[PDB]
Write a protein that binds this ligand. Structure first.
Ligand SMILES: CO[C@H]1/C=C/O[C@@]2(C)Oc3c(C)c(O)c4c(c3C2=O)C2=NC3(CCN(CC(C)C)CC3)NC2=C(NC(=O)/C(C)=C\C=C\[C@H](C)[C@H](O)[C@@H](C)[C@@H](O)[C@@H](C)[C@H](OC(C)=O)[C@@H]1C)C4=O
Ligand SMILES: [Mg+2]
Ligand SMILES: [Mg+2]
Ligand SMILES: [Mg+2]
Ligand SMILES: [Mg+2]
Ligand SMILES: [Mg+2]
Ligand SMILES: [Mg+2]
Ligand SMILES: [Mg+2]
Ligand SMILES: [Mg+2]
Ligand SMILES: [Mg+2]
Ligand SMILES: [Mg+2]
Ligand SMILES: [Mg+2]
Ligand SMILES: [Mg+2]
Ligand SMILES: [Mg+2]
Ligand SMILES: [Mg+2]
Ligand SMILES: [Mg+2]
Ligand SMILES: [Mg+2]
Ligand SMILES: [Mg+2]
Ligand SMILES: [Mg+2]
Ligand SMILES: [Mg+2]
Ligand SMILES: [Mg+2]
Ligand SMILES: [Mg+2]
Ligand SMILES: [Mg+2]
Ligand SMILES: [Mg+2]
Ligand SMILES: [Mg+2]
Ligand SMILES: [Mg+2]
Ligand SMILES: [Mg+2]
Ligand SMILES: [Mg+2]
Ligand SMILES: [Mg+2]
Ligand SMILES: [Mg+2]
Ligand SMILES: [Mg+2]
Ligand SMILES: [Mg+2]
Ligand SMILES: [Mg+2]
Ligand SMILES: [Mg+2]
Ligand SMILES: [Mg+2]
Ligand SMILES: [Mg+2]
Ligand SMILES: [Mg+2]
Ligand SMILES: [Mg+2]
Ligand SMILES: [Mg+2]
Ligand SMILES: [Mg+2]
Ligand SMILES: [Mg+2]
Ligand SMILES: [Mg+2]
Ligand SMILES: [Mg+2]
Ligand SMILES: [Mg+2]
Ligand SMILES: [Mg+2]
Ligand SMILES: [Mg+2]
Ligand SMILES: [Mg+2]
Ligand SMILES: [Mg+2]
Ligand SMILES: [Mg+2]
Ligand SMILES: [Mg+2]
Ligand SMILES: [Mg+2]
Ligand SMILES: [Mg+2]
Ligand SMILES: [Mg+2]
Ligand SMILES: [Mg+2]
Ligand SMILES: [Mg+2]
Ligand SMILES: [Mg+2]
Ligand SMILES: [Mg+2]
Ligand SMILES: [Mg+2]
Ligand SMILES: [Mg+2]
Ligand SMILES: [Mg+2]
Ligand SMILES: [Mg+2]
Ligand SMILES: [Mg+2]
Ligand SMILES: [Mg+2]
Ligand SMILES: [Mg+2]
Ligand SMILES: [Mg+2]
Ligand SMILES: [Mg+2]
Ligand SMILES: [Mg+2]
Ligand SMILES: [Mg+2]
Ligand SMILES: [Mg+2]
Ligand SMILES: [Mg+2]
Ligand SMILES: [Mg+2]
Ligand SMILES: [Mg+2]
Ligand SMILES: [Mg+2]
Ligand SMILES: [Mg+2]
Ligand SMILES: [Mg+2]
Ligand SMILES: [Mg+2]
Ligand SMILES: [Mg+2]
Ligand SMILES: [Mg+2]
Ligand SMILES: [Mg+2]
Ligand SMILES: [Mg+2]
Ligand SMILES: [Mg+2]
Ligand SMILES: [Mg+2]
Ligand SMILES: [Mg+2]
Ligand SMILES: [Mg+2]
Ligand SMILES: [Mg+2]
Ligand SMILES: [Mg+2]
Ligand SMILES: [Mg+2]
Ligand SMILES: [Mg+2]
Ligand SMILES: [Mg+2]
Ligand SMILES: [Mg+2]
Ligand SMILES: [Mg+2]
Ligand SMILES: [Mg+2]
Ligand SMILES: [Mg+2]
Ligand SMILES: [Mg+2]
Ligand SMILES: [Mg+2]
Ligand SMILES: [Mg+2]
Ligand SMILES: [Mg+2]
Ligand SMILES: [Mg+2]
Ligand SMILES: [Mg+2]
Ligand SMILES: [Mg+2]
Ligand SMILES: [Mg+2]
Ligand SMILES: [Mg+2]
Ligand SMILES: [Mg+2]
Ligand SMILES: [Mg+2]
Ligand SMILES: [Mg+2]
Ligand SMILES: [Mg+2]
Ligand SMILES: [Mg+2]
Ligand SMILES: [Mg+2]
Ligand SMILES: [Mg+2]
Ligand SMILES: [Mg+2]
Ligand SMILES: [Mg+2]
Ligand SMILES: [Mg+2]
Ligand SMILES: [Mg+2]
Ligand SMILES: [Mg+2]
Ligand SMILES: [Mg+2]
Ligand SMILES: [Mg+2]
Ligand SMILES: [Mg+2]
Ligand SMILES: [Mg+2]
Ligand SMILES: [Mg+2]
Ligand SMILES: [Mg+2]
Ligand SMILES: [Mg+2]
Ligand SMILES: [Mg+2]
Ligand SMILES: [Mg+2]
Ligand SMILES: [Mg+2]
Ligand SMILES: [Mg+2]
Ligand SMILES: [Mg+2]
Ligand SMILES: [Mg+2]
Ligand SMILES: [Mg+2]
Ligand SMILES: [Mg+2]
Ligand SMILES: [Mg+2]
Ligand SMILES: [Mg+2]
Ligand SMILES: [Zn+2]
Lengths: 164, 12, 57, 283, 52, 112, 1119
């Protein structure tokens, strides 16, 4: 029955919620605040729970639906896009990568590439970050190269203007 | 033509 | 148009009308069966090569 | 011809039949998906119906539904019209309704698309302006020629880099008067296109050299107010930008106003002294 | 060239016990004509406070 | 590389249906709420249509551009952005055939 | 200042209560102010009675009788302003008395059940549905009756039509095609118009002879005698003719339906439908519609007269039976009351629908309260009408005037059931009967023309929506001060004359004087003049009546003037016209702009916020003044006190002036001295040159107020907090963000400043691998929140004047779901006139400011006073409104004579009277000039030379005398200002009133570089802060196609809008100063191919030689 599948328990759950809202409409003259529904429902029902269930109860909406003056409006031309780098972002990754690549070269490939690859290539481990050389040489070159890199980049201000 | 009638008639 | 002040060159109307007669009808077939309505010059193509380059008029 | 028969139904891409988060938690999906599910469910129920054991009446019954379904995604309404459940008695747009439709695919493939380097504002008579040029609000020019400006900022001392030049302009109070001088330098010999409400003929779009000016209005030449049927009771004109050196070449060579003086309709001039000029020259 | 009512923050406010609105008053001030006698007076701040 | 100079519409062979396709959508499983991810093999599955994230894979074994043209050992994801997720085709395998209504109900029934 | 008003046509009766159309309809609609005892039982009470006696008898056990007693609604939940501060729908509560009966001993009466919260009307006539004041516009259509129209294609004879509305309820037609058939159609199929009469009881003999002895068509009636020889059997036989395959036996069931209750309408038993009857055809009503259920034997005093008139209409002159549909006596109007009462009854049926089900559900007798009533329907129904009806609109408060008309505007389109989109040109045209009932100028301009128009001055909806225009009686050659509001129809039976007829009082003065019988201009005699036009004002609308010399202006451009006022924006400095028509006063007063004194007394305190007056009755009341309020369209509405402390006020005198009133007079725009000549090009087609001097004085300046709003939403990723915290870069931008979070009142906000701050979460579900490294490098512990903060949208902002925040413990407000909290920021700004702005006089001259000139060099008069605005002459001949040129002349007089005048509509000032005042002006102008010590210029004499050679001044007279002549003509000498030389030839100048027009949101030039993109279609899309691209239409494509703009067109189809990969490489290329790249395939194309692949079809691009090529760059090959 639903576009976004809902287990049988949630289903009955939804029926009970509905039925309960029904007996509650019976006398208040006030479409129950999610307070009544919790109470009347039973043991572990709370406001967050009811607001959640009825949120799942709403079937979706037709991406293709008549909008505004129904004359000829279709709902999907209006939603923007997120993954796609709007021009601004493509230019970003251009300079960022070119400048990040320039700094990465004129350096020590021992702890810079370690933290460049460990951070920019696979996933986010000081110890497990460097090959054979222990932590003391990691923190040593990490913090000393990371600061010489930052302080000369402070001189020839190229990175300061936070690309982000 | 219209689908309910035909099956209804079909098994009925 | 003349009667309404407008003074547009005939040329234009011509270009248009011409295309109303880009197509004709058939009654003596060769490649495709007779009753068919097709582009005039496209037949000037067929008849041209069918009587000039490949024989058998 | 053995292909007219369907046994393998192509499914339209996913992002083209979205499932999106709307508001409060509302979602939004292309109608196509309710139709796709239709077919898949039926097709599956069919298989399981054949397997479980098969009473004839029921198998056809299904095969019928199935058929109908296969129609739905392709074209809805040719035979009955499918509906999303009680809410909207609306034909779920069929792939057909996609291509043709009230406002479909090849259809709006010709109604219009939105240009990226466009603009639009109120027009106002530009008496001293020469046919050659047009008054364009610097404020508009900025946004229009943003990227052309950015780079030009870097070539000068105003900004270190692009991203910099960007944030340098993200707020109005932050612009050094040095930027205007940069944009005014970027626009040197480039030209833009101006359009009018109904573009009835080719002169409905003309190219001019922008002469940056203050305010909101767009300064237009009086003589070409005849080509565009544009008077000044609030008529607004759009404006586009030629990005390629080619598009710019054509734009200012074969599309520039001061070049196209005689009409394509009649060998009569269209650069005729309109109302006020005659009145003068006559008296 | 400038005005500062003490409890008023923006130009579009109205002061209690005061029929006129800030905008009407700042307007009336433009009507005010003053005359100083020598260059030494470039910017003069005139003060006034009245009650009841 | 070469200019597109001719467009051509031609009927679909069932073997061509499958040629353009990837995987077979075999279950009415859109997306299941708990995780706004593609349910099972269903309409949105990542194998069938494609991964929903930039140069990165679904699980992340390979994540940048150096190896841009290869696929992941334990899971299948070759990448360039999600545009693939919007251009790829999947296909349903019908039990017992049915016909295109585009050819059956045009005034001249092209099949009749 | 003094006032002189010219025309004398004794205005016999004051103009009606301009909003009565809206006020009185809702009054009769809901008769709640008076007890159920009071007799007006239409509307609510009527709709109630209509569906209350629910008879449910047998299918199991029944005998149900729920009966209505009294309808009472009384205590409003909240009040007006609270309803606007908080998002609230001001509605009155209603619960009527109900008692359900039983077939078993007992009748339980459950007194109240409050179902349906029904909106109330403001004293002005407007509503308050949700935050914004709304208005219910009236409509028009075919009044439920019966008419005979000419047959479709066959030139032969015409056919009859019986019109019964509501929709459910038959639609009959009578047509005779003599080769062997007659046709009477209810739903569709036909049958003999006699089988029916037989049923009722009319036999062949009595019928044929009495009805059509004089009508030979009687022969077609007695034709099929075989069936006409069996009475009650004809009843079952017709049953048989209908078609389902129904039980022959059903005693008197279906005959009932076309009998008494439902289908035939249940409107006023005596005048509603029975009016269309006794005058047009037939004589009586034997109950509302053809109705009876007393003996099983039906009576139809309507079925025979319709044919009776068809035999009559076809055979000669019983009268001339041809109905012009568009006759207003046929064309009804729907006042608000009716529009609401209908939706109220629709809800009553929805209610009565569910209740019937519960007559069976409730176990035993205690079923009165909850068992029978549920308020769900009535709420939704009525609520849907005030918030979603295509009829309920935002108030048009650009300025009181505009908001008023908006309450008195009538439309075509609407219920869908009446005149929809298709049919047009016959309706859209100004029908003859539209006289004094509908303005002929008023209506819009476009596909939607003439269907939507506001009524006239003295036009009034009588009993049933029939605009009756007032016409005074003239018995013999005697004219009366008595007036008859005549229906459209009756107006034709008389010989009516115009008001322009020379009158000595009761005596007509000219033997051959104009009158117009029925839509035809006819020169009649004083002895034939039966009736006369009541007023020159009634012929048009209010909005139009405000025009000076309407008389001399082309009806076409006079429309422009009328709609122009509707767009007038209130100026802090308001001024009334130097020349007015006479309703300026009445407009402001009848609209609710200015505040008038109830009864005589003295003033106590005169605050800027309140005027507590003391009446002589021993009472004193505090009158608050809407200081600065937000009009729906963003125009200021302030009430500026005009009375000083301790002042004896006359009853009904202005205490304070409305948004746009100077002195109780409507005042928009500002009378400005104007020269009417050409300037360089600054005024070329329709351009206006303005004197800087107009800005020095705060003359054309207007206050605006936009209402920016942002929400703290609850995301599953983490609530969006609203705090002063703006995660990434500066405190400089946090200044005016004084209050932690909100912006400080009185702060000057420019585009791109934070109005309000908010913090949402970074990704959809997962963090960022690359952004993880960067944060760690300079400051790992970085607030993983996102800057989503309401900023000042390009365009403008002013200074914040008010702010509203609604947090967690809501007082009595409605916070939507997900919505954690809301934050409103009201901003205000001064709009000084400028080159982008458009001004226009009431006549129609519209135009934009093209140049603001320094007072230094614009046209100056002999005495140093210079002109404010210079209007191009050329804009006057083509258009035809000399009325403006007349205004400027009277104006010139008022300038030197320091006086304002009132020139009525067509009775007003006359060319000689103006020349007379000009004469008086010449003395103030040039008289002071004589005494102040000097005579005439070399310049003044020079222009005279050229003026005589022209023909404007009698050669041989002295310059002094010559200039008088030349002045009387309306023109004076003007020197350049730039050169100081004169402008060869006199030029006219004068006091013309000019308004400034409101700037729409579109005005805000939309310039977009790059921005969002639609999800499914990949074309540019805007919204909140990114402007959204312009549309490149086919008409525009061709424009380029015509030129050799090859690439420029590709660009528009690729790089600029749909080439996903193109626009990207495009930007970047531009960024690196790279000459843009060569276009990749457009997503339009790819979207297409695939949609096409979605259908069996295969679209494959090909090569030089027929071979593949690839559009989808590398994503289609498999795996
Ligand atoms: C019931 O609310 C909406 C129904 C729409 O549905 C339609 C299908 O039913 C309508 C009905 C039954 C109407 O009587 C009108 C229109 C429409 C529709 O279009 C109009 N439509 C237009 C025609 C052209 N479009 C442009 C389109 C092509 C892109 C703009 C509006 N003008 C329209 C009118 N004007 C006038 O009379 C004139 C000459 C001036 C008055 C102007 C003020 C400023 C407005 O009154 C304003 C306060 C506001 O009321 C509207 C903007 C309102 O919008 C809201 C949100 O309130 C709609 C009326 C109407 O009287
Ligand atoms: Mg529920
Ligand atoms: Mg139950
Ligand atoms: Mg709900
Ligand atoms: Mg909308
Ligand atoms: Mg993007
Ligand atoms: Mg590089
Ligand atoms: Mg380096
Ligand atoms: Mg190396
Ligand atoms: Mg190195
Ligand atoms: Mg190096
Ligand atoms: Mg590193
Ligand atoms: Mg590594
Ligand atoms: Mg991992
Ligand atoms: Mg190792
Ligand atoms: Mg160390
Ligand atoms: Mg060390
Ligand atoms: Mg170091
Ligand atoms: Mg040829
Ligand atoms: Mg050849
Ligand atoms: Mg040859
Ligand atoms: Mg050869
Ligand atoms: Mg040969
Ligand atoms: Mg087939
Ligand atoms: Mg949410
Ligand atoms: Mg379904
Ligand atoms: Mg069988
Ligand atoms: Mg069978
Ligand atoms: Mg259907
Ligand atoms: Mg259906
Ligand atoms: Mg359905
Ligand atoms: Mg559905
Ligand atoms: Mg259903
Ligand atoms: Mg269709
Ligand atoms: Mg279609
Ligand atoms: Mg010049
Ligand atoms: Mg200029
Ligand atoms: Mg910065
Ligand atoms: Mg600046
Ligand atoms: Mg420079
Ligand atoms: Mg400025
Ligand atoms: Mg305009
Ligand atoms: Mg426009
Ligand atoms: Mg190029
Ligand atoms: Mg002309
Ligand atoms: Mg204090
Ligand atoms: Mg205040
Ligand atoms: Mg002032
Ligand atoms: Mg001084
Ligand atoms: Mg000095
Ligand atoms: Mg000195
Ligand atoms: Mg002091
Ligand atoms: Mg190619
Ligand atoms: Mg090559
Ligand atoms: Mg196939
Ligand atoms: Mg698949
Ligand atoms: Mg859970
Ligand atoms: Mg799998
Ligand atoms: Mg891989
Ligand atoms: Mg995968
Ligand atoms: Mg990919
Ligand atoms: Mg399968
Ligand atoms: Mg006096
Ligand atoms: Mg006096
Ligand atoms: Mg008068
Ligand atoms: Mg009167
Ligand atoms: Mg009532
Ligand atoms: Mg009724
Ligand atoms: Mg009231
Ligand atoms: Mg006929
Ligand atoms: Mg009726
Ligand atoms: Mg009815
Ligand atoms: Mg017939
Ligand atoms: Mg008679
Ligand atoms: Mg006969
Ligand atoms: Mg009998
Ligand atoms: Mg039936
Ligand atoms: Mg009567
Ligand atoms: Mg009568
Ligand atoms: Mg009788
Ligand atoms: Mg008679
Ligand atoms: Mg007649
Ligand atoms: Mg009992
Ligand atoms: Mg109909
Ligand atoms: Mg039609
Ligand atoms: Mg028709
Ligand atoms: Mg007609
Ligand atoms: Mg007439
Ligand atoms: Mg209007
Ligand atoms: Mg009397
Ligand atoms: Mg008569
Ligand atoms: Mg006489
Ligand atoms: Mg005489
Ligand atoms: Mg008449
Ligand atoms: Mg007109
Ligand atoms: Mg009052
Ligand atoms: Mg009052
Ligand atoms: Mg006193
Ligand atoms: Mg008095
Ligand atoms: Mg007195
Ligand atoms: Mg003046
Ligand atoms: Mg949001
Ligand atoms: Mg800093
Ligand atoms: Mg951010
Ligand atoms: Mg961040
Ligand atoms: Mg930010
Ligand atoms: Mg703004
Ligand atoms: Mg307040
Ligand atoms: Mg909502
Ligand atoms: Mg809520
Ligand atoms: Mg909360
Ligand atoms: Mg301003
Ligand atoms: Mg003087
Ligand atoms: Mg004076
Ligand atoms: Mg008057
Ligand atoms: Mg005199
Ligand atoms: Mg004197
Ligand atoms: Mg003197
Ligand atoms: Mg003297
Ligand atoms: Mg002359
Ligand atoms: Mg003499
Ligand atoms: Mg003389
Ligand atoms: Mg901008
Ligand atoms: Mg922008
Ligand atoms: Mg962007
Ligand atoms: Mg690439
Ligand atoms: Mg590209
Ligand atoms: Mg470059
Ligand atoms: Mg290159
Ligand atoms: Mg390419
Ligand atoms: Mg294809
Ligand atoms: Zn993987």
């Amino acid at each position: 029955a639903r576009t976004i599948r809902i287990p049988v328990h949630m289903v009955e759950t939804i029926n009970k919620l509905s039925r309960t809202a029904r007996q509650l409409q019976q006398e208040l003259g006030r479409e129950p605040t999610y307070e009544e529904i919790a109470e009347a429902m039973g043991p572990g029902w709370d406001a967050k729970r009811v607001e959640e269930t009825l949120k799942i109860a709403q079937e979706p909406v037709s991406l293709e639906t008549p909008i505004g003056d129904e004359k000829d409006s279709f709902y999907g031309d209006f939603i923007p896009d997120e993954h796609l780098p709007s021009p601004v972002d493509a230019a970003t990754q251009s300079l960022l990568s070119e400048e990040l690549e320039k700094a990465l070269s004129k350096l020590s490939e021992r702890e810079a590439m370690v933290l460049k690859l460990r951070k920019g290539l696979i996933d986010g481990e000081e110890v497990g970050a460097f090959f054979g050389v222990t932590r003391e040489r990691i923190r040593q070159i990490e913090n000393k190269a990371l600061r010489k890199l930052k302080y000369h980049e402070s001189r020839t201000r190229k990175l300061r203007d936070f690309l982000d | 033509k219209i689908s309910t009638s035909d099956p209804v008639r079909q098994y009925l | 148009y003349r009667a309404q002040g407008v003074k547009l060159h005939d040329k234009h109307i011509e270009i248009v009308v011409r295309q109303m007669m880009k197509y004709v009808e058939v009654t003596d077939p060769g490649d495709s069966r007779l009753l068919e309505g097709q582009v005039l010059e496209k037949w000037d193509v067929e008849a041209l090569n069918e009587r000039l380059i490949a024989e058998g008029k | 011809p053995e292909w007219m028969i369907l046994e393998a139904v192509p499914v339209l891409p996913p992002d083209l039949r979205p499932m999106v988060q709307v508001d409060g938690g509302r979602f939004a999906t292309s109608d196509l998906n309710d139709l796709y599910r239709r077919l898949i469910n039926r097709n599956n129920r069919l298989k399981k119906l054949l397997a479980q054991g098969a009473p004839e009446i029921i198998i056809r019954n299904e095969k019928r539904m199935l058929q109908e379904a296969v129609d739905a995604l392709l074209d809805n309404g040719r035979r009955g019209a499918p509906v999303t459940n009680p809410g909207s008695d609306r034909p779920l747009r069929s792939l057909t309704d996609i291509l043709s439709g009230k406002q479909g695919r090849f259809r709006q493939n010709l109604l219009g698309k939105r240009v990226d380097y466009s603009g639009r504002s109120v027009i106002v008579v530009g008496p001293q302006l020469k046919l050659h040029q047009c008054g364009l609000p610097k404020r508009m020019a900025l946004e229009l020629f943003k990227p052309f400006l950015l780079k030009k900022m870097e070539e000068k001392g105003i900004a270190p880099n692009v991203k910099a030049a960007r944030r340098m302009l993200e707020r109005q109070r932050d612009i050094k008067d040095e930027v205007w001088d940069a944009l005014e330098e970027v626009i040197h010999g480039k030209v833009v296109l101006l359009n009018r409400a109904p573009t009835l003929h080719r002169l409905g779009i003309q190219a001019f050299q922008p002469v940056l000016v203050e305010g909101q209005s767009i300064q237009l030449h009086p003589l070409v107010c005849e080509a565009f049927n544009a008077d000044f009771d609030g008529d607004q004109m759009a404006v586009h930008v030629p990005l390629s050196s080619f598009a710019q070449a054509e734009a200012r060579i074969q599309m520039l106003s001061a070049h196209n003086l005689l009409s394509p309709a009649s060998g009569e001039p269209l650069a005729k002294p309109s109302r006020d000029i005659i009145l003068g020259l006559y008296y | 060239t400038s005005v500062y009512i003490e409890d008023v923050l923006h130009e579009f406010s109205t002061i209690p016990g005061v029929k006129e609105d800030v905008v009407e008053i700042i307007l009336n001030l433009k009507e005010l004509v003053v005359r100083f006698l020598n260059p030494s007076l470039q910017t003069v701040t005139l003060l006034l406070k009245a009650e009841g | 590389k070469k200019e597109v100079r001719k467009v051509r519409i031609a009927l679909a062979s069932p073997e061509k249906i499958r040629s353009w396709s990837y995987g077979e959508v075999e279950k009415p499983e859109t997306i299941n709420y708990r995780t706004l991810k593609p349910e099972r093999d269903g309409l949105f599955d990542e194998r069938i249509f494609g991964p929903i994230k930039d140069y990165e894979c679904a699980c992340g074994k390979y994540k940048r551009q150096r190896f841009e043209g290869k696929v992941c050992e334990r899971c299948g994801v070759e990448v360039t952005k999600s545009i693939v997720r919007r251009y790829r085709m999947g296909h349903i395998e019908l039990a017992t055939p049915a016909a295109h209504i585009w050819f059956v109900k045009d005034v001249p029934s092209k099949i009749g | 200042m003094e006032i002189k008003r010219f025309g004398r046509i004794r205005e016999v009766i004051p103009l009606p209560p301009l909003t009565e159309i809206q006020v009185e309809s809702y009054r009769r609609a809901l008769q709640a102010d008076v007890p159920p005892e009071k007799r007006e039982n239409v509307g609510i009470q009527a709709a109630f009675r209509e569906t209350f006696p629910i008879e449910e008898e047998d299918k199991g056990k029944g005998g149900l009788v729920l009966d209505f007693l009294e309808y009472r609604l009384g205590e409003p939940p909240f009040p007006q302003d609270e309803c606007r501060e908080k998002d609230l729908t001001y509605q009155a509560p209603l619960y009527a008395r109900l008692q359900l009966i039983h077939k078993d001993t007992g009748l339980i009466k459950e007194d109240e059940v409050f179902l349906g919260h029904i909106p109330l009307m403001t004293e002005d006539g407007s509503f308050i549905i949700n935050g914004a004041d709304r208005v219910i516009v009236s409509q028009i259509h075919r009044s439920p009756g019966v008419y005979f129209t000419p047959d479709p294609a066959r030139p032969g004879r015409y056919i009859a039509s019986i019109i019964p509305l509501p929709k459910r309820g038959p639609w009959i037609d009578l047509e005779v095609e003599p080769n062997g058939v007659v046709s009477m159609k209810v739903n569709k199929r036909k049958f003999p118009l006699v089988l029916l009469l037989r049923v009722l009881g009319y036999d062949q003999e009595t019928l044929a002879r009495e009805l059509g002895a004089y009508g030979e068509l009687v022969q077609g009636l007695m034709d099929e005698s075989v069936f006409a020889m069996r009475p009650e059997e004809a009843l079952i036989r017709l049953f048989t003719l209908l078609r389902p395959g129904d039980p022959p036996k059903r005693d008197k069931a279906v005959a009932y339906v076309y009998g008494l209750i439902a289908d035939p309408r249940r409107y006023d038993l005596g005048e509603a439908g029975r009016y269309k009857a006794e005058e047009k055809l037939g004589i009586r009503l034997s109950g509302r519609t053809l109705a009876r259920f007393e003996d099983g034997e039906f009576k139809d005093e309507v079925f025979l007269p319709t044919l009776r008139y068809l035999f009559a209409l076809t055979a000669g002159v019983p009268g001339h039976e041809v109905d012009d549909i568009d006759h207003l006596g046929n064309r009804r109007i729907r006042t608000v009351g009716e529009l609401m009462t209908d939706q109220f009854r629709v809800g009553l049926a929805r209610l009565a629908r569910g209740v019937r089900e519960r007559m069976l559900m409730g176990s035993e007798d205690s079923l009165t309260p909850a068992k029978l009533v549920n308020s769900r329907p009535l709420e939704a129904a009525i609520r849907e009408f005030f918030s979603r009806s295509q009829l309920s609109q935002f108030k048009d408060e650009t300025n009181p005037l505009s908001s008023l008309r908006h309450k008195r505007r009538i439309s075509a389109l609407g219920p869908g059931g009446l005149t929809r989109e298709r049919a047009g040109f016959d309706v859209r045209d100004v029908h003859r009967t539209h006289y004094g009932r509908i303005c002929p100028v008023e209506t819009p301009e476009g596909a939607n023309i003439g269907l939507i128009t506001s009524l006239a001055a003295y036009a009034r909806v009588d009993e049933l929506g029939f605009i009756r225009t007032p016409y005074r009686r003239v018995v013999g050659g005697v004219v009366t001060d008595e007036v008859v509001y005549m229906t459209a129809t009756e107006e034709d039976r008389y010989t009516i004359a115009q008001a322009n007829t020379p009158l000595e009082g009761n005596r007509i003065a000219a033997e051959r004087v104009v009158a117009r019988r029925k839509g035809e201009p006819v020169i009649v005699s004083p002895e034939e003049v039966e009736f006369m036009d009541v007023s020159p004002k009634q012929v048009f609308s209010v909005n139009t009546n405000l025009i000076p010399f309407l008389e001399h202006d082309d009806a076409n451009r006079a429309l422009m003037g009328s709609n122009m006022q509707t767009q007038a924006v209130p100026l802090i400095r308001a001024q009334a016209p130097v020349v007015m028509t006479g309703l300026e006063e009445r407009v402001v007063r009848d609209s609710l702009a200015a505040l008038y004194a109830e009864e005589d007394g003295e003033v106590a305190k005169v605050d800027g916020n309140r005027i507590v007056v003391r009446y002589e009755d021993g009472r004193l009341v505090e009158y608050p003044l809407r200081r600065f309020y937000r009009s729906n369209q963003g125009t200021a509405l302030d009430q500026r006190p005009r009375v000083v402390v301790g002042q004896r006020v006359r009853k009904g005198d202005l205490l304070a002036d409305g948004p746009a009133s100077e002195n109780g007079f409507l005042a928009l725009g500002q009378n400005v001295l104007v020269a009417i000549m050409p300037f360089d090009g600054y005024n070329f087609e329709d351009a206006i040159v303005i004197s800087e001097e107009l800005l020095k004085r705060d003359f054309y300046t207007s206050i605006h107020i936009e209402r920016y709003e942002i929400e703290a939403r609850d995301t599953k990723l983490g609530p969006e907090r609203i705090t002063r915290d703006i995660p990434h870069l500066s405190e400089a931008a946090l200044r005016d963000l004084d209050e932690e979070g909100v912006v400080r009142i009185g702060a000057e906000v420019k585009p791109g400043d934070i109005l309000v701050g908010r913090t949402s979460f970074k990704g959809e579900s997962e963090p960022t691998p690359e952004e993880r490294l960067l944060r760690s490098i300079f400051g790992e512990k970085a607030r993983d929140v996102k800057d989503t903060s309401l900023r000042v949208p390009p365009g403008e902002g002013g200074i914040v004047v008010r702010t509203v925040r609604l947090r967690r413990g809501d007082p009595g407000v409605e916070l939507k779901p997900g919505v954690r909290e809301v934050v409103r920021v009201y901003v205000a700004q001064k709009r000084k006139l400028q080159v982008g702005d458009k001004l226009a006089n009431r006549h129609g001259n519209k135009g934009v400011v093209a140049k603001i000139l320094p007072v230094e060099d614009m046209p100056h008069l002999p005495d140093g006073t210079p002109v404010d605005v210079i209007l191009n002459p050329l804009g006057v001949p083509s258009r035809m409104n000399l009325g403006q040129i007349l205004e400027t002349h009277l104006g010139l007089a008022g300038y030197f004579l320091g006086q304002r005048y009132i020139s009525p509509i067509f009775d007003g000032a006359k060319e000689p009277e103006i020349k007379e005042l000009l004469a008086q002006a010449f003395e103030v102008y040039f008289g002071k000039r004589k005494g102040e010590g000097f005579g005439v210029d070399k310049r003044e004499v020079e222009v005279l030379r050229r003026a005589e050679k022209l023909g404007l001044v009698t050669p041989g007279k002295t310059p002094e005398e010559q200039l008088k002549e030349l002045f009387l003509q309306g023109k004076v000498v003007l020197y350049d200002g730039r050169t100081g030389e004169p402008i060869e030839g006199p030029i006219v100048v004068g006091q013309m009133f000019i308004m400034k027009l409101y700037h729409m949101v579109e005005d805000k030039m939309h310039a977009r570089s790059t921005g969002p993109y639609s999800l499914i279609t990949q074309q540019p899309l805007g919204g909140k802060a990114q402007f959204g691209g312009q549309r490149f239409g086919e008409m525009e494509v061709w424009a380029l196609e015509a030129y050799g703009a090859a690439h420029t067109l590709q660009e528009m189809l690729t790089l600029k809008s749909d080439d996903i990969e193109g626009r990207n490489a495009a930007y970047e290329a531009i960024i690196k100063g790279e000459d843009v790249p060569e276009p990749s395939v457009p997503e339009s194309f790819r979207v297409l191919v695939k949609e096409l692949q979605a259908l069996a079809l295969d679209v494959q691009t090909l090569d030089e030689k027929d071979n593949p090529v690839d559009i989808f760059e590398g994503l289609a090959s498999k795996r």
